[PDB]
Amino acid sequence: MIKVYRYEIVKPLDLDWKEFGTILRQLQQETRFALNKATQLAWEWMGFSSDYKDNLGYTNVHGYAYHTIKTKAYRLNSGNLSQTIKRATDRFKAYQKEILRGDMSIPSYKRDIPLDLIKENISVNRMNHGDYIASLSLLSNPAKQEMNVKRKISVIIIVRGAGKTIMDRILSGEYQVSASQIIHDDRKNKWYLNISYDFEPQTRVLDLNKIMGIDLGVAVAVYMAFQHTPARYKLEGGEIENFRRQVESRRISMLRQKPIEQLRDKIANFRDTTNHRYSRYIVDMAIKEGCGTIQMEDLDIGSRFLQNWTYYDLQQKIIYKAEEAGIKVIKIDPQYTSQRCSECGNIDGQAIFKCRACGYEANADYNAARNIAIPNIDKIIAESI
Amino acid sequence: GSMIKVYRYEIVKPLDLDWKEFGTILRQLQQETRFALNKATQLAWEWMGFSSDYKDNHGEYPKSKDILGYTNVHGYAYHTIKTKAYRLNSGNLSQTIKRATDRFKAYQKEILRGDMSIPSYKRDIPLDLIKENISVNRMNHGDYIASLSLLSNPAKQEMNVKRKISVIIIVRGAGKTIMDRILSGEYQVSASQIIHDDRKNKWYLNISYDFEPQTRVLDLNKIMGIDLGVAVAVYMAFQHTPARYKLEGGEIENFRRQVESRRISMLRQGKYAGGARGGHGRDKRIKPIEQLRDKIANFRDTTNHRYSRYIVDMAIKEGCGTIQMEDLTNIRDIGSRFLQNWTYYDLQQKIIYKAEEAGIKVIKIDPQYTSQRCSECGNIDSGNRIGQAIFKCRACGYEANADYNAARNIAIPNIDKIIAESIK
DNA sequence: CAAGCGCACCTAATTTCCTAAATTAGAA
DNA sequence: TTCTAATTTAG
RNA sequence: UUCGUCGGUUCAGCGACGAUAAGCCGAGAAGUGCCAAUAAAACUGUUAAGUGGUUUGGUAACGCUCGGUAAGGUAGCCAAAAGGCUGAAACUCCGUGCACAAAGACCGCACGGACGCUUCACAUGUGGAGUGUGAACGGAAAUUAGGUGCGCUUG
Ligand SMILES: [Mg+2]
Ligand SMILES: [Mg+2]
Ligand SMILES: [Mg+2]
Ligand SMILES: [Mg+2]
Ligand SMILES: [Mg+2]
Ligand SMILES: [Mg+2]
Ligand SMILES: [Mg+2]
Ligand SMILES: [Zn+2]
Ligand SMILES: [Zn+2]
């Protein structure tokens, strides 16, 4: 429902960077003071204070802390200060049992404390020129008069890539702006705006035009890829190789000095057990992405990572579990699913695939999985020749 | 003029109690130790806040002799914690509280400034001990009995132990010589600890002793340089002899790569695993990685020991009395060393303390263009960076390994000032 | 794969520390 | 009555 | 000719052993989440209204909490019963003592020899020393910085 995205700050719109930085550092100092004093006031409120300290008219911890710290930290806006106090007292109340028991000393806050912003204090807008603008109301009433900074401090953010969709939804009206924060990173020496967007998620429904292509990789066991989304899932069969080495060496040892009958049962049972966990995971990734259909090669060894696995059992179990979950399964002929590119489509080292006609580079197993994920790949492969 | 070292001693069995009762005693005392540490830190932080408020209001700082009733926070913390921690012995509790209050006092400004958070102490805190509460006696039949004083008087009545809790420890190897020297009188025991090793489920007695190192006669005008080279892990060179000693890393990063690969592989298997790995908690879901808990660290600890002892022994063999090395602080030094993710700080610390034992002074110098300076001439030119592998001095026709030249330049006394005068 | 949030688990780098004198109390 | 472990705090 | 347990500590070998251990199971409710009821601090606005989301009890999916699970070898008799005697078993061999009846706890220690073996020395040998599989043996806590894994969200 509530998730956050980061937007780097380019420049203040109406103020030089020096005044903006001075204001931000002063407000960071006030925020850290508010957090520490609120933690100490919460300590006093709960009754943890020692005997000598005592040798309140409010209702909750937050009210008393906010009213006490309101005087000294007058530069911060009332809403931002209240959010900071709530953060402090909520961190104290969660760790309350540990502090009393003695499993934790005291909550502490760093020097580069992010500043807070309530929903009704951060406003974002676009421009005809395309420059994305955000408006922040940080200072209180006396602070604006003291610093001669009127209106709200307009800023310019970087809105590109996967962040443009979120911002477009925010400005369109679908998403809403929740409580946000200003974040400073010392290393990169840049500021950020943690705009938290509020939205109603939609329950995914299986669509037959969403495919989860599947291939047996040479580096991993199975690589799952989709063409509608760049999400990727892989089954790294490390335990399979560990068990293979264990069984081979045990058979070598027991050869020297009925005995191996137990080994034959253990190998067969482990394959069935492994084929159940793999099938459950494979289908459960089609459900999460809503892939209404699954495309997998139908089944020599072919130098797959599972050197001598029982592929037919895995395919049958995948088919059965997909039928249970309302997922159709297709069997695509794997002629050149690995050699063909996933973007250019030119059908021209082992681990990393290359597209000499386009320069695209990715994992070879992922490339083959994506090629399989393309609908009706058999026909376009035939026509490609 | 006195060093301090430690040695471990595995505890076999409780001499008079059973292993179950002894384990319960140890767990309860661990809980008391952790509680005391956290409470001492809490009281220190509260007193800091009260002092600041008092200075702001009344105009002057409050003297602890009036408000607290004790001179320092250690005394007040002992007077407070001892009621709820009546199972630890008085000396051990006082030592623990002093450790906590000394850690808070050392970094008080950083705590107020915000660079350092308030210290918090973990679950498996080692038990503390002092020299007055540890005594070791050896029987005629080759057994070492450690009479530990771990409990308080109220705890003695409740736990039904009317004397010092005694344990039997294995004292072999160099541990045998250390214990014999302690009993004879050469080594004086200091505050010690009890630690638990989860991998082997073994308790250890961590005796820390004080001793006078054997300081020989070594002139200060014989200097050995050390460079964490690009090809060889550590290259050693001298100015008076053309002697070169190398420590090429036959096995350095392979161990870390293997352990990290295995850990990542088994961690990613939590999504598709058996039915008994999910549904029982975080510790059980991450159970398979407990085999790789300390393989990377322990391998490097032994590897850094082997390198350091070899380095120190070479200094004695050539008769040196000074070891100059690099100042890697803030990663200002060369970013391309043969070791990739090694713990250079641990290697440097080991070299420092072993040299101090061997009566050798270690001096750190700031490196600037050290791999490019010509030892024979002194011309600071950057044109000899041939992959940081072969050094060819054009101005002198000198060809040699870059690591040897770097170590030789570090071996020149006051190399930092010489460089600063040469180019700045 | 990329970018955020939450949680915890691993490495390294850096620092401080590794009391003790005096008094009391219980057992011989 | 002597004495050796605990116990308390100064610095 | 893979992982792991024991053989004093770390790394490596060796001897025995165990492994589907990247496996199996149990209890419970501090958290994430789900179900139900209730709606505090604070802010803007006269007030009305809005933003904000607080407290309590349930269920039991969880990288939810607490946990349990395999791994070296060892000698019997006497008395009715307590106890007594003999002295087996782990990283070279022998002798003499001390200590050991079931062990999470015992398989060890000291002295004298042999046999290897690491240093040194004096003339391939000879003699001192350490040495018993090889190397090593200054750790603990905390903070800081980075990385990783899992879950969620967007592309
Ligand atoms: Mg997605
Ligand atoms: Mg014994
Ligand atoms: Mg055992
Ligand atoms: Mg070992
Ligand atoms: Mg025997
Ligand atoms: Mg001998
Ligand atoms: Mg050994
Ligand atoms: Zn292409
Ligand atoms: Zn030159």
Side-chain angles (χ1 to χ4, degrees):
Chain A
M1 268 269 176
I2 302 182
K3 290 298 168 184
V4 187
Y5 203 85
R6 270 208 187 173
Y7 298 87
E8 181 180 341
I9 310 187
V10 168
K11 54 173 180 181
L13 189 57
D14 301 338
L15 301 172
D16 189 17
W17 256 98
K18 298 178 183 179
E19 316 161 3
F20 193 42
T22 291
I23 291 174
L24 289 194
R25 289 186 215 89
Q26 293 193 7
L27 292 192
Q28 266 196 333
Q29 179 184 0
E30 296 278 16
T31 308
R32 197 176 72 92
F33 159 77
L35 283 164
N36 280 345
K37 188 69 177 186
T39 279
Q40 166 183 354
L41 289 172
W43 170 278
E44 165 194 5
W45 178 275
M46 309 284 186
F48 298 153
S49 66
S50 41
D51 302 359
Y52 72 86
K53 212 172 185 114
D54 320 332
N55 184 24
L56 286 165
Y58 301 93
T59 316
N60 314 343
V61 197
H62 180 276
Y64 165 48
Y66 161 74
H67 274 272
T68 301
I69 309 174
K70 175 188 42 186
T71 306
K72 311 184 191 176
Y74 67 97
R75 305 168 173 270
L76 284 171
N77 198 18
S78 304
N80 317 350
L81 184 51
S82 303
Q83 276 282 328
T84 282
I85 300 309
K86 183 183 179 183
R87 216 167 76 211
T89 66
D90 286 8
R91 272 234 321 187
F92 191 82
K93 194 176 177 180
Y95 294 136
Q96 174 177 10
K97 289 182 175 179
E98 300 182 5
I99 299 187
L100 181 61
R101 282 207 311 260
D103 300 350
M104 179 188 182
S105 174
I106 261 299
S108 179
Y109 305 100
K110 61 178 174 174
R111 192 157 177 77
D112 204 6
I113 275 302
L115 314 87
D116 305 359
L117 272 151
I118 310 219
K119 155 166 184 170
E120 45 198 7
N121 293 334
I122 167 173
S123 170
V124 200
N125 291 310
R126 215 174 176 193
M127 290 300 177
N128 312 356
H129 327 270
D131 310 353
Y132 275 93
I133 315 296
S135 307
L136 327 165
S137 310
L138 305 167
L139 325 170
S140 181
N141 189 21
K144 296 177 75 168
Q145 182 178 357
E146 290 163 359
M147 302 186 183
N148 205 5
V149 177
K150 215 183 181 180
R151 313 167 185 178
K152 321 174 185 174
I153 300 181
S154 308
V155 299
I156 287 96
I157 57 186
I158 309 184
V159 175
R160 70 186 177 181
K164 192 161 183 181
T165 310
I166 297 300
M167 187 60 66
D168 286 350
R169 294 165 187 270
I170 279 181
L171 308 189
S172 65
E174 179 182 3
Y175 286 17
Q176 302 179 5
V177 200
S178 178
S180 57
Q181 285 183 349
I182 309 181
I183 288 199
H184 179 241
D185 189 12
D186 287 0
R187 292 213 168 189
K188 303 176 59 186
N189 196 3
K190 295 159 185 179
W191 299 83
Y192 306 93
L193 275 176
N194 272 42
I195 307 179
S196 63
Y197 53 93
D198 199 6
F199 74 124
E200 291 186 2
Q202 175 175 0
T203 58
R204 298 191 183 177
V205 178
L206 295 141
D207 176 27
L208 285 194
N209 284 354
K210 301 173 183 176
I211 292 69
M212 181 189 80
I214 270 199
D215 68 329
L216 314 172
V218 190
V220 295
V222 170
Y223 227 111
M224 293 153 282
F226 329 89
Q227 205 184 10
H228 73 289
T229 171
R232 352 177 158 195
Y233 302 132
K234 48 177 168 175
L235 287 159
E236 319 169 11
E239 71 278 355
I240 285 184
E241 206 171 351
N242 278 170
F243 179 77
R244 261 142 53 177
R245 303 169 203 168
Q246 156 179 348
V247 143
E248 287 155 1
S249 306
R250 287 178 67 164
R251 181 175 179 177
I252 287 173
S253 303
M254 301 316 168
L255 176 60
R256 295 181 182 174
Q257 295 176 335
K258 173 183 56 183
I260 323 293
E261 179 70 19
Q262 299 289 343
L263 260 185
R264 176 59 175 185
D265 188 20
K266 291 180 191 309
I267 297 162
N269 190 16
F270 169 82
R271 285 212 185 102
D272 305 349
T273 305
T274 307
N275 272 325
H276 270 304
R277 324 187 315 249
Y278 280 24
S279 305
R280 177 48 54 198
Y281 181 76
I282 268 173
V283 172
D284 282 6
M285 298 331 263
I287 276 176
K288 202 174 74 166
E289 311 289 333
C291 313
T293 50
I294 300 175
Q295 289 204 9
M296 62 192 192
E297 36 187 5
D298 63 331
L299 299 96
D300 51 357
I301 284 179
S303 178
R304 308 292 191 178
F305 180 85
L306 327 168
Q307 298 167 351
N308 204 1
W309 206 261
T310 57
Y311 305 115
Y312 169 83
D313 175 33
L314 191 50
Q315 281 185 89
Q316 166 70 18
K317 287 191 172 167
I318 282 171
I319 282 167
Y320 161 54
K321 293 181 176 186
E323 287 158 347
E324 276 187 316
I327 303 182
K328 190 191 186 182
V329 171
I330 329 284
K331 295 174 188 56
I332 273 313
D333 181 21
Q335 315 181 15
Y336 319 103
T337 62
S338 301
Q339 331 167 1
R340 183 222 169 191
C341 198
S342 54
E343 293 178 351
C344 74
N346 292 39
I347 321 199
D348 309 23
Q350 300 175 1
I352 299 180
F353 171 78
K354 293 182 179 180
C355 178
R356 302 173 179 180
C358 66
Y360 179 64
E361 290 190 3
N363 203 15
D365 331 57
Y366 182 66
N367 168 46
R370 211 185 176 202
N371 296 1
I372 296 186
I374 292 192
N376 202 352
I377 171 62
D378 272 351
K379 281 197 181 180
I380 101 181
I381 266 186
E383 301 291 331
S384 307
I385 304 302
Chain B
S2 53
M3 215 143 194
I4 175 154
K5 306 196 305 181
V6 300
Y7 212 78
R8 276 173 170 89
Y9 289 102
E10 168 190 348
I11 297 183
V12 173
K13 74 180 190 60
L15 194 54
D16 301 344
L17 312 171
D18 300 5
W19 252 126
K20 313 298 177 185
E21 312 160 3
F22 198 35
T24 297
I25 291 175
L26 293 185
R27 297 308 173 179
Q28 289 164 347
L29 291 195
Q30 270 192 350
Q31 292 176 339
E32 301 280 21
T33 328
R34 174 198 196 179
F35 162 81
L37 286 156
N38 296 344
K39 274 293 300 178
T41 40
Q42 294 169 1
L43 298 184
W45 164 88
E46 178 205 27
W47 168 247
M48 176 180 71
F50 183 88
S51 67
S52 175
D53 289 359
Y54 197 90
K55 170 192 187 176
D56 287 347
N57 296 27
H58 300 254
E60 294 185 0
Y61 270 139
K63 301 175 182 179
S64 57
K65 194 51 186 179
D66 310 351
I67 314 297
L68 290 182
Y70 294 84
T71 311
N72 303 332
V73 201
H74 172 254
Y76 182 62
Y78 176 79
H79 187 78
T80 304
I81 299 173
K82 81 187 186 190
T83 302
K84 211 154 304 175
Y86 73 109
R87 278 172 175 167
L88 266 161
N89 199 23
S90 293
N92 311 1
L93 172 67
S94 173
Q95 177 82 28
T96 307
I97 291 174
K98 167 150 172 292
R99 286 194 197 275
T101 43
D102 278 0
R103 187 172 296 279
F104 195 92
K105 190 183 182 180
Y107 311 98
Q108 177 149 344
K109 310 184 316 178
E110 287 83 22
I111 273 161
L112 280 157
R113 194 176 167 193
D115 306 356
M116 177 168 306
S117 48
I118 314 275
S120 178
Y121 297 83
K122 68 177 186 170
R123 169 176 180 82
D124 212 4
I125 272 293
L127 296 82
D128 288 5
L129 276 168
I130 46 189
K131 55 177 187 180
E132 282 81 12
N133 289 351
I134 304 177
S135 172
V136 174
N137 317 91
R138 158 188 159 94
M139 326 313 293
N140 294 284
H141 58 258
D143 264 7
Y144 294 84
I145 297 183
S147 296
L148 311 174
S149 311
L150 295 170
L151 298 176
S152 185
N153 263 350
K156 281 187 182 190
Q157 177 182 4
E158 301 160 3
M159 305 188 176
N160 223 8
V161 194
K162 300 182 181 180
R163 278 188 172 180
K164 301 198 203 63
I165 295 191
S166 294
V167 283
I168 297 190
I169 56 184
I170 321 172
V171 186
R172 306 200 190 116
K176 184 182 170 52
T177 76
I178 291 180
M179 191 55 62
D180 276 357
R181 290 218 179 103
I182 277 187
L183 299 178
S184 73
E186 309 192 24
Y187 298 175
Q188 323 179 6
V189 193
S190 55
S192 303
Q193 282 169 347
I194 285 186
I195 53 191
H196 178 262
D197 187 25
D198 302 358
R199 177 204 167 183
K200 289 191 167 183
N201 196 9
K202 285 190 173 190
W203 297 84
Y204 295 83
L205 188 45
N206 220 23
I207 299 180
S208 57
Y209 46 83
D210 171 33
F211 66 117
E212 286 276 344
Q214 304 183 356
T215 68
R216 299 163 305 203
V217 183
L218 309 165
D219 185 21
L220 293 187
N221 292 1
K222 303 188 176 178
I223 165 62
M224 177 183 76
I226 295 176
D227 156 50
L228 319 170
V230 181
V232 176
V234 157
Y235 225 88
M236 280 166 279
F238 318 83
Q239 63 180 11
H240 43 87
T241 60
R244 287 162 276 190
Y245 301 121
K246 71 173 184 176
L247 272 181
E248 49 182 5
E251 180 182 356
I252 289 297
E253 319 92 6
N254 327 114
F255 206 89
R256 176 161 189 168
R257 286 184 170 183
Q258 289 154 2
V259 175
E260 282 179 330
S261 307
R262 286 183 50 200
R263 179 146 42 198
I264 295 184
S265 182
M266 54 176 48
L267 275 174
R268 286 171 166 182
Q269 207 237 10
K271 301 171 289 185
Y272 44 101
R277 200 166 156 181
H280 299 270
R282 171 171 291 105
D283 300 355
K284 275 269 96 169
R285 162 87 75 171
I286 322 178
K287 189 207 173 188
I289 84 155
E290 292 174 0
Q291 315 152 352
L292 315 171
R293 276 285 165 159
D294 293 336
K295 281 168 184 164
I296 292 183
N298 292 357
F299 180 86
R300 294 174 150 172
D301 204 16
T302 303
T303 309
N304 285 234
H305 271 307
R306 285 167 179 162
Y307 287 169
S308 305
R309 179 90 287 172
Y310 184 81
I311 283 173
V312 170
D313 283 353
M314 289 301 109
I316 321 170
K317 187 187 182 184
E318 302 283 347
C320 299
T322 303
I323 303 172
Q324 276 197 166
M325 51 171 33
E326 303 158 345
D327 180 18
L328 315 160
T329 312
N330 206 14
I331 330 172
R332 177 55 200 164
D333 205 0
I334 327 294
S336 299
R337 301 164 284 188
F338 178 77
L339 324 168
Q340 301 170 3
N341 289 4
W342 218 236
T343 165
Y344 311 87
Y345 191 75
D346 222 35
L347 179 55
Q348 273 196 343
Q349 191 167 353
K350 280 173 175 56
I351 293 160
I352 283 175
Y353 93 84
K354 299 196 187 187
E356 190 174 356
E357 298 184 17
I360 319 183
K361 173 183 184 182
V362 170
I363 307 176
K364 293 203 174 192
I365 56 96
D366 164 44
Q368 288 196 9
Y369 315 93
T370 314
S371 68
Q372 298 162 359
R373 192 203 178 275
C374 164
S375 64
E376 175 168 345
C377 68
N379 179 22
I380 302 198
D381 208 16
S382 54
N384 299 359
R385 191 179 178 180
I386 314 172
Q388 298 166 342
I390 320 177
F391 192 82
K392 175 184 178 180
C393 178
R394 172 180 182 178
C396 44
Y398 175 84
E399 301 189 7
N401 182 25
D403 285 351
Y404 169 51
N405 183 42
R408 192 151 183 173
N409 275 335
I410 303 170
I412 289 181
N414 295 359
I415 175 60
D416 191 8
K417 314 170 187 179
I418 287 176
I419 290 164
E421 299 147 1
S422 303
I423 55 183
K424 295 175 181 178

